[PDB]
């Protein structure tokens with residue numbers, strides 16, 4: 001009933017879920033685990049939604065466009081408060097809720113594989129930490145590492161792999177930057193370097209960016225959704241809590257327009273958030289090209305503040321709090337569901353299954369799937385790294401989930417600009433595919449000895465958790481036995497490849 005889309009705060013497992021993960025078959029014990037997690041909850045990415053609505057508020061106040069002076073005061077208080085809170089935290093930065101999400105995930109990662117890690121501490125095993133290099137990803141990982149270390153009494157602190165390209169020389173010193181697997185959607189890397197032309201990583205990012213920038217199905221479908229009459233009706237319905245009918249009628253008639261500038265006009269300057277140091281926090285300055293032209297723009301901007309306000313829960317104290325939830329109560333939650341669809345649709349079409357007949361939107365995650373299998377192989381073939389813990393982005397998780405065919409990401413939309421992705425015709429939701437701190441974890445077990453039905457060793461087996469729910473792999477994959485969520489590593493190398501073939505009976509133990 002709250003409709004936070006992919007700003008949904010992570011929902012940690014209850015002690016029932018966390019204690020009922022399936023046991024591996026008799027004879028199999030842990031040898032490896034790994035993860036990729038999105039950063040946790042964050043503040044606003046830049047001075048933009050809050051900036052534009054303040055410009056709109058200024059004009060509404062001048063023109064008598066608020067429904068009352070108390071509603072005006074409350075709206076401006078809410079805008080000022082969340083802006084102030086982002087100046088204080090840093091635009092784009094992890095919040096307290098986001099740190100707590102990753103602390104708990106880290107604690108539970110140690111606990112789920114306690115025997116693996118206690119053995120690693122006694123036998124010289126190593127743990128590898130990786131980040132895209134983006135601050136909120138690295139800081140998420142730092143909090144995971146803190147929770148992991150606290151749960152294990154610090155007994156693994158001396159078993160961390162030393163990065164050759166650390167995210168920073170301070171709290172992030174344990175994090176190897178790996179933007180080829182954790183930032184494969186862009187040529188530019190978060191640390192300010194770029195992928196090198198001609199590398200596989202550069203070509204993957206470059207081809208993807210060129211595809212999405214020019215694809216007519218994606219562009220037409222997003223246009224259909226942006227101009228949908230029910231989205232416009234929802235936008236008006238929401239905004240009428242705050243602004244008068246006359247004010248909104250003028251906006252509907254194109255008589256108002258606001259740019260993200262000092263005075264909301266086209267000739268205004270770059271405006272930075274009040275009290276921000278643009279050299280310390282450049283994201284506190286807005287892109288002047290952003291604008292409110294419609295009720296749709298304004299309502300989607302307000303919805304974005306509501307959902308990020310949930311991410312900023314821990315910051316929402318003191319004398320400049322914000323109460324955007326007040327605008328999405330009762331029947332206005334129906335409006336929130338419309339805005340969540342519009343926001344989800346952009347992500348779905350650009351980074352998820354998207355439309356039928358193409359795999360460009362999610363094939364970009366192949367380097368991460370490659371690494372998920374390659375780091376298992378490194379361990380089974382005699383390496384000492386017992387875990388690889390990775391921290392990244394929604395732009396990592398959405399294509400990865402579609403490439404793997406995870407629950408929620410199994411349905412492409414029609415190859416159509418009018419029969420588009422909707423909540424009625426697709427299971428994809430930001431709140432469940434890629435909440436804040438969304439994560440995929442794989443546990444790998446093995447049986448000692450020589451398999452007398454082959455010449456060599458028993459095949460390692462693999463089990464997946466998605467947002468800490470144990471899930472099967474995609475339906476083409478055959479588990480090791482009836483009733484099992486464990487899969488042979490050989491089976492996964494076959495059934496997760498493009499053909500999705502199964503080894504059939506040879507997948508059974």
Ligand SMILES: [Zn+2]
Pocket residue numbers: 084085088318320
């Ligand atoms: Zn303050």
Ligand SMILES: [Zn+2]
Pocket residue numbers: 236237240245
């Ligand atoms: Zn109305």
